[PDB]
Design an enzyme around this catalytic site. Sequence first.
Site: not given
Length: 393
Positions: A114-118, A124-128, A150, A393
């Site tokens: 619920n809080f995937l935050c970069i 630019s490092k595409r950490l998702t 989400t 959320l």
Amino acid sequence: SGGPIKIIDPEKVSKEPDQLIEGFEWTTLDLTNETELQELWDLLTYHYVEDDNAMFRFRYSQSFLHWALMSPGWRKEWHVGVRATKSKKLVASICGVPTEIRVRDQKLKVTEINFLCIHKKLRSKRLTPVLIKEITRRCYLNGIYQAIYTAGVVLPTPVSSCRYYHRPLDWLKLYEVGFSPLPHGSTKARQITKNHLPSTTSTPGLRPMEIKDIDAVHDLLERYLKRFDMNQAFTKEEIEHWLVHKDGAGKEQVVWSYVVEDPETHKITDFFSFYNLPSTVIQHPKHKEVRAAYLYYYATETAFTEDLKALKERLLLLMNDALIQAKKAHFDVFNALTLHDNPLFLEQLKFGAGDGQLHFYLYNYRTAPIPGGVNEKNLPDEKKMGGVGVVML
């Protein structure tokens, strides 16, 4: 119907996280520590909204963050961060709470992310994928093999996409802060008249939810949610955490819930809820915040008669009362998505379409795309419901 992409053996899963890019390191957040809560709060406030001209942004709070992240079964180990090694500053986070969902008749233990935050500097490092891989590795070690998360952007294949809708409650305030536009040829009086609400509710038997209602809301919500392709499962302990406000020192109310007690049979026939997440107005002479309510879970016995006309009329009644209760609690706007049965009432109750979209993703699970309440023109349509019964959320 679908199924897992991979069956995983928890004894074969690595007990150590993946090596990160050069100068960064994993951390476990202790959100009972107010200094670490502050770190996450600061990361979220400035880096969690993906667009860089956002002249609005969410205002989190200890009460909101505790509500969202400290639900029954929560572990510190599922509050994951990334820090810069040299400075130790927190530059990314991914948090999960364990729960269960049903996907086309199949029940799954999941982490709901619920809080995937970069941090802006690391986009630019595409950490998702890297954060998702690490929180799910931690969940794999505890017998949870799937996740749901989400995003406001399309990434390789949402299972569903829903559109945001907004019902002004204090239209003048929303106009003053640039949230609501003034349509061409119209006037403040016209828009104030448009959004006017009665001062009292109309549903007979409606009143606030209480501890004694937990068993009845649990049964009714579960029966209603099972009707949707992808839906949240609740234990009774989850019903009480997510839906029953508990008053206490230093504690601000995050969620409002109401039930309808049928005046004759005295059973709980309806219920609805909504939560508070204000948005900060990035500088304005008179108004600091938009106090925003978000429609949460609801249910009605009328759903099971299977005639759409009666369900529409019942939802028009119930949700106009939800608008009245929010206005009474001094909310400026009432937000909702096109999920659940919401397209039956959004336009009639004068919700305006937003430009926001919410996209739903499943991790380690394959299933057919799930209708999100909107047609090919991104407009609400009653033939495109029955799909999404999880409110993230």
